[PDB]
Design a protein around this nucleic acid. Structure first.
Ligand SMILES: Cc1cn([C@H]2C[C@H](O)[C@@H](COP(=O)(O)NP(=O)(O)OP(=O)(O)O)O2)c(=O)[nH]c1=O
Ligand SMILES: [Mg+2]
Ligand SMILES: [Mg+2]
Ligand code: NA
Ligand code: NA
Length: 326
DNA sequence: CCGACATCGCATCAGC
DNA sequence: GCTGATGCGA
DNA sequence: GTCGG
């Protein structure tokens, strides 16, 4: 349904969600508000009262009261107030820097560091991740057109095969769902020699090669199985491209398709597919699918050699990635 | 009344 | 030195 | 904040 229908309400709830996570440090209120915003966004009617909204799962007494005030006044007294509040609004904003969470944002503001300009004057007080997040603040909030994603995929697949032709690399996330644009790039990686019981260099080799051809420009974090970094397409006369976020995960061969499924998403799709994993005694994480015991204890991971099989367990017929927005 | 609310890899801190 | 706890992003 | 044991 159109955003115009209840966009005022869902915007209100989303904003309330952010202040709970970032300022109050209340992650479960954050999720509570997001759940309510999500169920209202789908509601195919213009809400006329808080009582009407309360019928929806996730909308309770308090949010009903808030909707009634919003409907009556076009605003929320509490939200207007915290908006004007220099301390809280500065804390909330600083968390938009990748690496600065609710705790670090609080500490910065506590000592008078409230803006991007303040952060730029105080590099000594930032860790490696936070410096990169600051350096590319604007770029990291930009979206990536599918055309650039395809160009980015071309490079990753080419360099990965160049290192070792037995590698298998899959770009997942919103890209795999065929989305017209993405927020970042999620790469899943595997190799015939790495399974449930087996170098740390398997991931390193790839990262290093992508650095060699000057695709990967910065590193946020890098372990034996998980890389988080920054990349950039080569210049065109044309201006240069924005720097983008890219993750690369090395996953055991015998867990690849659970991984591919999990990190393809969507969030809301996985949340739904997991809920019905329960439906008839299955549990699914990013590694395995397991049967639940007679009293709810998961047993042995089952064999999986395709996304298909994971569907052949909870008894749901295959959904193409393009249909997994929900 | 009151506990659950998703989970995991990596960087960094708290402390022995 | 080290192990364990916490912050963080996805 | 919501839900339910
Ligand atoms: C944010 C998030 C994502 N995921 C999973 C589902 C996502 O589909 C997948 C990748 O995360 P993402 O890159 O933030 N989401 P996306 O790739 O579908 O969409 P976008 O274009 O990156 O915004 O990882 C979680 O399991 N827990 C999370 O908190
Ligand atoms: Mg993504
Ligand atoms: Mg991502
Ligand atoms: Na309700
Ligand atoms: Na942040």
């Amino acid at each position: 349904p159109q955003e115009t229908l209840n966009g005022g309400i869902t915007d209100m709830l989303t904003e309330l969600a952010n202040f709970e996570k970032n300022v109050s440090q209340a992650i479960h209120k954050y999720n509570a508000y997001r759940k309510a915003a999500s169920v209202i966004a789908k509601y195919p009617h213009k809400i006329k009262s808080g009582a009407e909204a309360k019928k929806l799962p996730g909308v309770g007494t308090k949010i009903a009261e808030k909707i009634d005030e919003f409907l009556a006044t076009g605003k929320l007294r509490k939200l207007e107030k915290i908006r004007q509040d220099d301390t809280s609004s500065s804390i909330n904003f600083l968390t938009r820097v990748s690496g600065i969470g609710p705790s670090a944002a609080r500490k910065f503001v506590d000592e008078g560091i409230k803006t991007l300009e303040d952060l730029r004057k105080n590099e000594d007080k930032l860790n490696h991740h936070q410096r990169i997040g600051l350096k590319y603040f604007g770029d990291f909030e930009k979206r990536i057109p599918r055309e650039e994603m395809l160009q980015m995929q071309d490079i990753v697949l080419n360099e990965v095969k160049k290192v070792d032709s037995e590698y298998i690399a899959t770009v997942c996330g919103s890209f795999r769902r065929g989305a017209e644009s993405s927020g970042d790039m999620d790469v899943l990686l595997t190799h015939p020699s790495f399974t449930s019981e087996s170098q740390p260099k398997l991931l390193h080799q790839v990262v290093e090669q992508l650095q060699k051809v000057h695709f990967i420009t910065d590193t946020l974090s890098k372990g034996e199985t998980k890389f988080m970094g920054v990349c950039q397409l080569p210049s065109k006369d044309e201006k240069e491209y924005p720097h983008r976020r890219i993750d690369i995960r090395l996953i055991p061969k015998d867990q690849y398709y659970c991984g591919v499924l999990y990190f393809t998403g969507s969030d809301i799709f996985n949340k739904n597919m997991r809920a019905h994993a329960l439906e008839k005694g299955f549990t699914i994480n990013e590694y395995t699918i397991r049967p639940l015991g007679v009293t709810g204890v998961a047993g042995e991971p089952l064999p999986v050699d395709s996304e298909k099989d994971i569907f052949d367990y909870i008894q749901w017929k295959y959904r193409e990635p393009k249909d997994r927005s929900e």
